[PDB]
Design a protein around this ligand. Structure first.
Ligand SMILES: CC(C)(COP(=O)(O)OP(=O)(O)OC[C@H]1O[C@@H](n2cnc3c(N)ncnc32)[C@H](O)[C@@H]1OP(=O)(O)O)[C@@H](O)C(=O)NCCC(=O)NCCS
Ligand SMILES: N[C@@H](CCC(=O)O)C(=O)O
Lengths: 435, 436
């Protein structure tokens, strides 16, 4: 109680991710009991890597947060104890469970549950076993699915306790009925119900794969449901399986504020993912729409003049804006990330790419970038040999010429000797921000 | 002890620099508690920045790491030494300090000691006051230099005590003859004797400037005495002071094991310095030497084939090694890092750069590489897209062209036409290594 809370202040204040951590914590003080963070976790995780999952969640709690873990039984019961005590598995719609199957489920869930609760503590944490008592559900089928039910009220009583106790709540997917009868609850429906009730600021999905994947099989860093979602469903390259993950994640995020955001990762990266503007693994949000224009008189110059001053660290120089010509402006509804292109001897030129810290974190920088380079297949830009955005530029560039102070990039398909003459012109261009 | 450990690690394991801090712990878990560091503090730094000082020294103490911090009063001591008076004389090259200076010196350092010890604790740490009882010296010269001495034997019992208890041992520079006589001790001669006695993994020199400087006047991230010490000592931009500093830093490091490393940095930087590849100071190793040669014959190509199978995921194609026509090669004395340069339509072109993780971190990747780009001012290379070292490449290139699979870099002033030419060539060169 004494030594912990304190000896991480005067600890992670000498660490490198340290200031950036203290700051989510503080601002993530939309405490309200357990409004902290709901976390679904695959059954094939509690199995194939417990000590990690358990170290992961222990860190959260000893750092400040109060996770509300929910868990399934996949491998451990979809296999083992049913192909074993020989009741077999009956899949109608998707998964029924006659009377004989119940004591197997009850048995196994309270096992993994406890497995996890104890593991966390083993790993430095404080946790609380909540195997039954939260999910009150009706049995909707009877003659069909046998003994499966739907969450008709959430009981936070027991969760509430753990929260004030400094413990993580570890909840299994069993629910009584209004008459006290046991029944199974697939975790998809059960995370909806819980996440509505609590209204959390964060929603993690801990999977073995620990991510969600772009067109090129790489990890999909960030999704803007507002802009990116449409194309995403109606997209040949996104499988049916993932399409659901989406149809079902929007369903979640639409039930929460815009403060809210879901994160899919694997435990070993979960922390580096909740506390870095980088991240690791897919982060999703309702996000904002982007307005795209070429009519300057259609732009909050003063608001933008703020966006720039804030992003760069210095003020644009006098009457810079009134002069500015403007080929195309892409600005996010909130004005927290913009790109403005002028022209240069007939090349699309990136005059300002300005994005704010928290805007980078919601993955909007990326979102503005995309629409820009979906506009300008040939694009020239410069940057200071300092601006730490250079590395993001270098992976988007196709060309790059370095000098002591400036660095010109291109993203067209022209060649070293074709750009040659326009590359020189960007270097020649004068600073439009001060010292 | 394995109680603290277990958990204080189960935290870092999730911190960006968690891995390197975890390692230091494990290394220095028992019996070597006092073998981790010999932190020397400028008398000037206990003056202005005492709080920040304590807060670093404190942050170490609070993760497992128990320093042996040594100090020497400096300025506050000269000011006080002129108060009473009789302050001057340097007959030799060290000061002369006579009987009258003593009572002041001892009570001046003693106070500085306490000051610091109590400071570390306020900061949150745990420390020990060792104002005297560690430095047993003989007395250099009677008449000439007064009551100055030279350390002969180090009595480490008081520091094992501290270290053993999880406490940073704060040692002040005060001597004591074998006939009991108390005596003045020069900090440098005193730190050398202690680093001997202890054989630390580290020897940190804390200052205000917090780093050594290059010809440019920027900071000198590192040094590789095996290679860099000759060059540095003939250079006309390396003044006296800095020569004399490197000299001493060498005498220490020749006396420690290989793993040892001297850092000179600033209190605010100590963490970054000791737990990031980069740090915020000048870091010095004894290091290993590099050979340069036009003479493929004169190389262990069997080793090299490994160095390159181990760096890259896979090994060179069949016959790559026979075939190869070396322009120049720089291989490190241990074949943990090598640049191999061939020729391409005239230009020097970089056919192999391979640096193992362990070597990349010790700072050899750069040592080979400076040696390369020094030989080949105009250089053309290439790298795959998914290559770890592309960022360092891009920091070092003068321009670069990127295609999906590969990327061609270059250095040196080089006309557009000159460059597009050679570039389309290096894109053409076929895989000298096997595929993924
Ligand atoms: C650009 C250049 C390198 C040549 O290649 P190119 O024919 O123009 O084609 P590009 O290099 O532009 O195409 C490469 C890019 O397309 C992109 N791309 C392709 N598929 C993609 C995908 N699924 N997702 C995202 N980006 C994708 C990339 O962003 C990539 O570069 P990257 O490595 O930074 O990611 C050029 O500077 C050049 O050398 N031109 C001169 C031509 C010549 O023959 N010169 C000789 C004498 S005149
Ligand atoms: N990336 C390596 C060589 C890879 C290859 O050409 O096969 C280098 O340039 O040093």
């Amino acid at each position: 109680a004494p030594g912990v809370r304190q000896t991480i202040v005067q600890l992670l204040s000498h660490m490198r991710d340290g200031k950036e951590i203290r700051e989510y914590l503080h601002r993530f003080s939309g405490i309200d009991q357990e409004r902290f963070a709901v976390i679904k976790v695959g059954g094939a995780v509690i199995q194939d890597d417990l000590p990690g999952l358990a170290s992961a969640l222990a860190f959260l709690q000893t750092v400040g947060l109060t996770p509300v873990v929910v868990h399934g039984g996949g491998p451990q019961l979809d296999a083992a104890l049913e192909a074993a005590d020989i009741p077999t598995e009956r899949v109608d719609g998707l998964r029924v469970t006659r009377d004989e199957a119940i004591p197997i489920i009850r048995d196994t869930l309270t096992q993994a549950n406890l497995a996890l609760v104890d593991a966390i503590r083993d790993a430095g944490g404080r946790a609380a076993a909540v195997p039954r008592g939260v999910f009150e559900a009706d049995i909707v089928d009877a003659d069909k699915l046998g003994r499966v039910g739907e969450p008709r009220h959430i009981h936070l009583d027991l969760v509430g306790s753990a929260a004030r106790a400094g413990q993580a709540a570890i909840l299994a997917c069993l629910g009584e009925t209004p008459d006290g009868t046991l029944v199974n609850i697939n975790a998809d429906v059960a995370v909806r119900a819980l996440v509505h009730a609590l209204q959390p600021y964060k929603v993690v999905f801990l999977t073995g794969t620990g991510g969600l994947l772009d067109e090129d099989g790489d990890i999909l860093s960030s999704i803007n449901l507002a802009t990116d979602f449409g194309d995403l469903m109606q997209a040949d390259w996104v499988n049916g399986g993932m399409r659901l993950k989406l149809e079902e994640i929007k369903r979640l995020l639409d039930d929460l504020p815009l403060s809210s955001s879901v994160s899919i990762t694997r435990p070993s990266e979960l922390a580096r993912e909740l506390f870095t503007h980088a991240g690791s693994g897919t982060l999703i949000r309702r996000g904002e729409r982007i307005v795209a224009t070429d009519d300057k008189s259609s732009l909050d110059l003063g608001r933008l003049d703020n966006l720039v001053k804030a992003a760069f660290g210095r003020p644009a120089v006098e009457g810079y804006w009134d002069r500015l010509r403007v080929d195309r402006a892409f600005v996010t509804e909130s004005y927290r990330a913009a790109a403005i292109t002028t022209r240069l001897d007939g090349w699309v030129y990136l005059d300002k790419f300005a994005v704010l810290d928290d805007a980078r974190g919601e993955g909007l920088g990326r979102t503005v970038w995309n629409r820009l380079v979906d506009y300008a297949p040939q694009l020239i830009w410069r940057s200071r040999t300092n601006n730490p955005v250079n590395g993001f530029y270098f992976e988007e560039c196709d060309g790059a010429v370095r000098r002591d102070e400036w660095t010109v990039f291109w993203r067209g398909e022209m060649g070293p000797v074709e750009v040659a003459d326009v590359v020189e012109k960007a270097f020649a261009l004068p600073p439009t921000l001060e010292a």
